[PDB]
Design a protein around this ligand. Sequence first.
Ligand code: NI
Ligand code: NI
Ligand code: NI
Ligand code: NI
Ligand code: NI
Ligand code: NI
Lengths: 117, 117, 117, 117, 117, 117
Amino acid sequence: HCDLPCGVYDPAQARIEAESVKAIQEKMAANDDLHFQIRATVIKEQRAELAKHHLDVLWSDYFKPPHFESYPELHTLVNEAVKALSAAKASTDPATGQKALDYIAQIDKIFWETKKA
Amino acid sequence: HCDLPCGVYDPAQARIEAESVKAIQEKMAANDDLHFQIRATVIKEQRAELAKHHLDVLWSDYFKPPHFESYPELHTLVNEAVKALSAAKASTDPATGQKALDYIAQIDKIFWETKKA
Amino acid sequence: HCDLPCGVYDPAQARIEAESVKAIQEKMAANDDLHFQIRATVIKEQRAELAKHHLDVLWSDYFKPPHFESYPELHTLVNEAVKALSAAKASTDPATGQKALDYIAQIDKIFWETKKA
Amino acid sequence: HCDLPCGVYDPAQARIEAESVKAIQEKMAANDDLHFQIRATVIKEQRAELAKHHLDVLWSDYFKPPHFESYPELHTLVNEAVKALSAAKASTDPATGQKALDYIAQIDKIFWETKKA
Amino acid sequence: HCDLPCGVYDPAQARIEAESVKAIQEKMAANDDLHFQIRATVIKEQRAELAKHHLDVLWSDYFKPPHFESYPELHTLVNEAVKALSAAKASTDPATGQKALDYIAQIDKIFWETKKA
Amino acid sequence: HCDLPCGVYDPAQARIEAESVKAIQEKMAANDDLHFQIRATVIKEQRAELAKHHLDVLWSDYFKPPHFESYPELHTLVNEAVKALSAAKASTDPATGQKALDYIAQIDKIFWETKKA
Ligand code: NI
Ligand code: NI
Ligand code: NI
Ligand code: NI
Ligand code: NI
Ligand code: NI
C-alpha cells in the first residue's frame, strides 16, 4: 500500500478510520459544548480524509483491470465510498458515518475474494 | 479541491507535479553521481505521490455520477493515469513521466468540457 | 520547486490555493451554520498555509540574487503577500483573500518576466 | 486514536505497517538493483515511522494508569517495540521486521485483554 | 531525533510547542469571538500534537534501557506528560497548558542529567 | 509561530534541525555503507526541509515591517540561510551544514535584539 509495491494491503486501514468518524459523530450528539464541537469537527475531518486516502490507495494501487472486469460495480462502489466519507465530513449525523462503513464493508469483502487468486 | 467543498479545481495541480517528475527523470540521465541519484529518487517519489493525490481528488470530489455516465472511459482513464504515475516512481526513464503527462492531458480535456457543459 | 532542483516552478500553485481561500470566504458569507463555519475556517486555514508555502518556495528556491538585484521591491512584495495570506486566515472578509491574490498577481508578473529573460 | 477522544483503537494499524516493513525487507533480498534499493529504503523508513506513531498512540492515549499497573511490563514492551521498528529502519534483514511484529503481537494480546476486562 | 540516528536531541522542541499551547489558551480568555475561538482551538490542537510527538521521540529514541532502570518513574513521567498535553487539547484553561509544561520541565532535568552522565 | 498568532517564536527550532543536518553529514563521512548513505541522505533532506520551514516562518510571521526597516539585511540573510540549507541537502560536506548554522546564528542575534528593543 506504499507503492513500492510492498504487496501488503488491508481495507482495515480505511475501516478503522471510518469507524472513528462515526464514533465522533455519536459523541457530538451527546455533548453540545462549543469547544468540544469544534474539536470533534476538526478531528472528524482529519480521520475522514485518512479513510479516503486508504480507499484511494486500494483503488489506484491494488485493484487492477481483471478486478474491475470481474466486479463491474467496483469503480462505482469505491467512488460512492469516498463520496460517502466526504458527506460524513459535512455532517454530525452518525448515519452518514455508517453509510461510509456500509460501502467499505463491501470493498473489504471484494478485496479478500480477489486475494484468493 | 479541499472537500469543503470550495468549488475550485484545476488538473494543473496534477500536471505541474507530473512535469517535475519527468524533469527529474531527465536530470537523472545526465548525472550518475550516487548521492544525486538518491536525492532524485527520493524527490521524484514525493512529487509523483502529490500528482496521484491531485488526480484522486478530481476523481473522488470533482467528477460526479453524471460525468462517469457521459464519459464511460473516465474511471479507467484516471485509474490508468495514477498507475502511470506509480510506474514513473519506479523508473528513471523520462518516457514513463511523459506517459503520465499524456493521461493527465486526456483528463484535463474532459475536465474543461464538463466545466463548460 | 522540490529543491532537487527540478527546474519546474509556477506561481499557479500559490494562486490556486489563494483562490480557494477567497472562494471559501465567499461561501462563509452565505451560510452562518455553526458547523459549516467551523469546517470552512479549518479548511481555509489549510489552504492559506499551502499558499504561503508555495510563495516561500518561489522566494527561497526560484528567485536568485540577480532577480532581487533587478527587482528591489521583490523581497518586500513576497513578504507582504505571505502576510496577506496570514490576514486571510484570520478573516472571513473576501477582501482579504483578494488582497493576497493581488500580491500574487504582482509576483506572477515578475516571475514570468524572469522566465522569458 | 485521534485524541478527541473517539474511543476507537486497534493495534492492527501498527501491525499492518510493520508487515509492510518486513515485506519490503524480504523484497530487498530478491532485487539488488540500485534504484530499487533506494526506493525500498525510502519507503521502509516511512512505513516504519507510521508503525512507531501508531504504537506511540496506543501507549499515550489508549492505555490508562490502571492498565500499566495491571501489566507492569507494558511500558517496556511498547518501548522495545518502537525501538525494534527503529532497528528495522536501519536494516534489510527481515528478522528485524519480524522482531517488531513479535512485540506488536504481544501488545495486541494485552490490548484485547483490556478491552474485555 | 530523526532516527538515523543523528545524536541530536533537546527537550526544547517539546517545550516550545507546549509554550505555544499555553500561550494560545491565554489568548482564548481575552477574546470570545467565535472565529478566533475556532482558529485558536484548531491551532492549539496542532501544536499540542507536535509537543506530544517530540516527547514520544525522546521516550522511544533518546532514552535507553539503562535510563529507565536508573529512573524508575521515567516511563510514568513521560506518559503523564503526553496525557497532560491531551488534556490541554481539550481545555481552554491555561492551567492545563502549565501542567504539561511542569511535566516537561521534569523530563528536561532528567534529560540533561543523562547527557552529563 | 503557528500563525494564530500565538506570540511564541524561537530561532532554536531552526537551529536544532540545522544541527541535525551537520551531524548527519559528519556521520556520512564515517560510514560508506550504501544503505546507511541512502538513509542519511533521506533523513538529512527531511531535517533540512524542516529547518527551511522554521526560517521561513520567522521571516513571514515574526519579523514585521519595522523590523525589516531596522534590519533590511534580514531579507538577504534569511534568503541566504535557506539557500544554504538547500545546498546542504545536496552535499555530504559538513562545511555546508556549518554555513547554514552560521547564517542562523546571525539571524538569531537580530531576533533577540528585536525581542529586547
Ligand atoms: Ni505498500
Ligand atoms: Ni477545495
Ligand atoms: Ni522542484
Ligand atoms: Ni481517536
Ligand atoms: Ni535525529
Ligand atoms: Ni505560533
